[PDB]
Design a protein around this motif. Sequence first.
Motif, mmCIF file in Angstrom:
data_model
loop_
_atom_site.group_PDB
_atom_site.id
_atom_site.type_symbol
_atom_site.label_atom_id
_atom_site.label_comp_id
_atom_site.label_asym_id
_atom_site.label_seq_id
_atom_site.Cartn_x
_atom_site.Cartn_y
_atom_site.Cartn_z
ATOM 1 N N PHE A 1 0.898 -1.444 -0.065
ATOM 2 C CA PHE A 1 0.061 0.111 -0.023
ATOM 3 C C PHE A 1 0.935 1.268 -0.085
ATOM 4 C CE2 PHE A 1 -3.033 -2.908 1.273
ATOM 5 C CZ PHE A 1 -4.147 -2.465 1.058
ATOM 6 N N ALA A 2 0.281 2.306 -0.466
ATOM 7 C CA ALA A 2 1.061 3.618 -0.226
ATOM 8 C C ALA A 2 -0.042 4.582 0.456
ATOM 9 C CB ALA A 2 1.174 4.284 -1.745
ATOM 10 N N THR B 1 6.236 17.631 4.345
ATOM 11 C CA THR B 1 5.607 16.251 3.661
ATOM 12 C C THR B 1 6.252 14.996 3.520
ATOM 13 O OG1 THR B 1 6.503 16.747 1.672
ATOM 14 C CG2 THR B 1 4.669 18.210 2.115
ATOM 15 N N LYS B 2 5.829 13.896 4.233
ATOM 16 C CA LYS B 2 6.485 12.732 4.288
ATOM 17 C C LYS B 2 5.697 11.660 3.636
ATOM 18 C CE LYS B 2 6.706 13.853 8.402
ATOM 19 N NZ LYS B 2 7.063 15.488 8.530
ATOM 20 N N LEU B 3 5.969 10.979 2.840
ATOM 21 C CA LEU B 3 4.989 10.015 2.157
ATOM 22 C C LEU B 3 5.680 8.640 2.547
ATOM 23 C CD1 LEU B 3 5.521 10.141 -1.587
ATOM 24 C CD2 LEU B 3 7.302 10.217 0.086
ATOM 25 N N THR B 4 4.569 7.508 2.851
ATOM 26 C CA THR B 4 4.851 6.243 3.333
ATOM 27 C C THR B 4 4.466 5.255 2.600
ATOM 28 O OG1 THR B 4 4.958 7.136 5.781
ATOM 29 C CG2 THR B 4 4.107 4.929 5.503
ATOM 30 N N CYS B 5 5.130 4.322 2.236
ATOM 31 C CA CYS B 5 5.359 3.114 1.662
ATOM 32 C C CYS B 5 4.932 2.013 2.513
ATOM 33 C CB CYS B 5 6.293 2.866 0.611
ATOM 34 S SG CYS B 5 6.338 1.006 0.003
ATOM 35 N N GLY C 1 8.262 2.734 4.421
ATOM 36 C CA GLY C 1 9.057 3.558 3.830
ATOM 37 C C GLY C 1 8.967 4.900 3.356
ATOM 38 N N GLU C 2 9.673 5.904 4.232
ATOM 39 C CA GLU C 2 9.276 7.198 4.225
ATOM 40 C C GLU C 2 10.428 8.046 3.475
ATOM 41 O OE1 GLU C 2 10.622 10.145 6.143
ATOM 42 O OE2 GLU C 2 12.405 9.298 6.444
ATOM 43 N N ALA C 3 10.133 9.317 3.066
ATOM 44 C CA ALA C 3 10.615 10.299 2.287
ATOM 45 C C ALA C 3 10.333 11.595 2.509
ATOM 46 C CB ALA C 3 10.712 9.749 0.821
ATOM 47 N N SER C 4 11.114 12.461 2.769
ATOM 48 C CA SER C 4 10.723 13.914 3.108
ATOM 49 C C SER C 4 10.841 14.643 1.774
ATOM 50 C CB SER C 4 11.449 14.738 4.176
ATOM 51 O OG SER C 4 11.093 14.036 5.383
ATOM 52 N N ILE C 5 9.817 15.196 1.129
ATOM 53 C CA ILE C 5 9.708 15.707 -0.040
ATOM 54 C C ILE C 5 9.128 17.141 0.238
ATOM 55 C CG2 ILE C 5 8.963 15.155 -2.514
ATOM 56 C CD1 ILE C 5 10.173 12.793 -1.394
ATOM 57 N N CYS C 6 9.280 18.110 -0.653
ATOM 58 C CA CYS C 6 8.779 19.446 -0.527
ATOM 59 C C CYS C 6 7.817 19.533 -1.516
ATOM 60 C CB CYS C 6 9.799 20.437 -0.345
ATOM 61 S SG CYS C 6 10.354 21.126 -1.790
ATOM 62 N N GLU C 7 6.802 20.606 -1.213
ATOM 63 C CA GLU C 7 5.585 20.486 -1.799
ATOM 64 C C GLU C 7 5.473 20.305 -3.151
ATOM 65 O OE1 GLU C 7 2.873 22.190 -3.132
ATOM 66 O OE2 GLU C 7 1.322 20.902 -2.652
ATOM 67 N N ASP C 8 6.065 20.999 -4.100
ATOM 68 C CA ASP C 8 5.818 21.325 -5.423
ATOM 69 C C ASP C 8 6.058 20.233 -6.199
ATOM 70 O OD1 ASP C 8 4.969 23.043 -7.456
ATOM 71 O OD2 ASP C 8 6.330 24.423 -7.137
ATOM 72 N N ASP C 9 7.052 19.167 -5.691
ATOM 73 C CA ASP C 9 6.984 18.042 -6.603
ATOM 74 C C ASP C 9 5.868 16.978 -6.369
ATOM 75 O OD1 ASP C 9 10.495 17.463 -7.156
ATOM 76 O OD2 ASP C 9 9.505 19.198 -7.118
#
Lengths: 224, 224, 221
Positions: free
Chosen positions: A4-5, A19-23, A65-73
């Motif tokens: 899942f994501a 913004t951190k997105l989780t796998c 699985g996390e990754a810190s991204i910034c918003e415009d991507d």
Amino acid sequence: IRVFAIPPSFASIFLTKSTKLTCLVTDLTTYDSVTISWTRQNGEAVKTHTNISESHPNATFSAVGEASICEDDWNSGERFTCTVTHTDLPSPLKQTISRPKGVALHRPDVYLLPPAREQLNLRESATITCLVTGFSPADVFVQWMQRGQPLSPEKYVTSAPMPEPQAPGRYFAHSILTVSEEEWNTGETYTCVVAHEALPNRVTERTVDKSTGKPTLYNVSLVM
Amino acid sequence: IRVFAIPPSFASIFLTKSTKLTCLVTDLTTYDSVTISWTRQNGEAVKTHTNISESHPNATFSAVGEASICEDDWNSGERFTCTVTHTDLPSPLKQTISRPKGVALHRPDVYLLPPAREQLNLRESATITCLVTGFSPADVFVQWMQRGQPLSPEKYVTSAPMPEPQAPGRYFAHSILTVSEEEWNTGETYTCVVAHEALPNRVTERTVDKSTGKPTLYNVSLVM
Amino acid sequence: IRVFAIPPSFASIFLTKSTKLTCLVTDLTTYDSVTISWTRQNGEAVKTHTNISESHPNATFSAVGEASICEDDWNSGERFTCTVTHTDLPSPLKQTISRPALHRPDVYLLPPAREQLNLRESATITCLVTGFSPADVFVQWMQRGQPLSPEKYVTSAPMPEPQAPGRYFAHSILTVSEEEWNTGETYTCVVAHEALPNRVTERTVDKSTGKPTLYNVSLVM
Ligand SMILES: *[C@@H]1O[C@H](CO)[C@@H](O)[C@H](O)[C@H]1NC(C)=O
Ligand SMILES: *[C@@H]1O[C@H](CO)[C@@H](O)[C@H](O)[C@H]1NC(C)=O
Ligand SMILES: *[C@@H]1O[C@H](CO)[C@@H](O)[C@H](O)[C@H]1NC(C)=O
């Protein structure tokens, strides 16, 4: 074998701005040294996905699985893929998640309703309901401030956006706050801020105090 | 050949939300083939640029470079470096911009001020005046919005922040909006939003209407 | 190779009433044995300029010329000229200055917002000076007749008005405690601007500027 994501929504961004997105990797047998990665559209690399969790004592699978991204991507339309390889399924698994553009955006009307006279005439505790009506899409962030000082989130409770009865593709939500009514007799500030994507500056504040919808009673009209 | 770093202030990275750093060069010869290169502290590759300015009347020239970055990258202070290389320079020319950290943070207590009764006696044009006091650092943004929708960005004038008299590290700015006496005497509620880097949702707002000086319990009239 | 003067403004006349001409030199490389010569339009002599300047801290030079001229020839345009005779120039250079529409301000004070008299710890009175032309009014603040200190108010510069084409505005804020403003306290603000007829306007606010003076409603228990 499911991967899942869990993406970041507006409530998750705006509370944190980080913004951190989780796998999420679930439904396997309990093997160690898991191999997961967070990749962009162009195959690059991100922050490491530290803070691995414990496995499951009911024998299902657990890896994040996390990754810190910034918003415009995340808004421009870059698809973000979690890649999964392991010992049970050693084939490359792709779980893609992005922000699904192609939806409208209307602005939330906010009305902050003061406690009813049936509730106060016990003199026990009053609850103020911020009503966040009319909006679309979902994922609004309602939080409460007591004169420029954010209240503890053990105190208010936000609903979930349930779709509006007579409005077509819109929503609403609610958020109640239980004030001790002894604090409402001094009646200080109680503002309700509501963070949506369709506002101009993305934050609306409404306020209600002990004397807000009170009409004028004593119309003295002296004439000479 | 002078170089000028114009870093985006908080007003600039709030009113467009598209953080966009730029650097210019004056005192330059009126020849083509400009290169202004932005780079990071480590040296990746950035956005290119166009829209280079025309000649000076005094046989001089000025060239311009525009890029775009992330907001956390500004707040992290990766000092972005812009370098000039041309067919008229003797040597490389450079500038390193950042976020000037080492500052306090303070809350602007906005107060909206309704026009003088002297001026709603001449009966042409009031002047409502949002006073934004107490903050630190500089670079506040003020915008006027009447009934949700924003008023024209040349019907109001923010000043520049000036150091407050007694309190040392703080500032104050003003902003005035001109209405006529017929727009005020209906009421229109006239919101004044203040965007500043020390506020919790970074946008606060106040509102006034002509029924704000009223005592709104008694309506003591007087006829003849 | 330039010379820029510091001519008197209206704030330079009216604050001191000892109007003066001052001029400084720049883009000249550092030297000594310089002469600056304040000189009138028709060439007659002036007050002897003293208090010689220093070098610039950017590998260049500065030089100062002083004078004290009364107002009738300055208001009519005596094109005052400060000659530099240097070592970089065997060609001495004459840099002239002058004093080049008139509307009157409408000072309105604005009493502090009722949001600010709930904190009961600071209040800011705000003498709004709208409508005038040219710039540089001199605003100051008199309390009960005796003028208040210059470290208890600020004043912006003129900033060109939103809708009016060539007219300005300014502001001036004076901070008082709530115990000051809640006990009477007349607080006159006085604008000083040349297109006024009397050359000075002053206006006043106390706490009681708005209650309608026929009736007086009270809310008792
Ligand atoms: C209040 O009194 C005024 C004074 O004449 C009158 O015109 C008006 O009808 C009254 N308003 C209400 C709501 O009773
Ligand atoms: C309040 O008083 C004004 C004064 O004449 C009157 O016109 C108005 O109708 C009154 N309104 C209310 C709501 O009492
Ligand atoms: C009205 O006048 C009386 C006596 O002059 C005074 O006690 C009262 O405070 C006044 N009303 C208000 C609102 O101050």
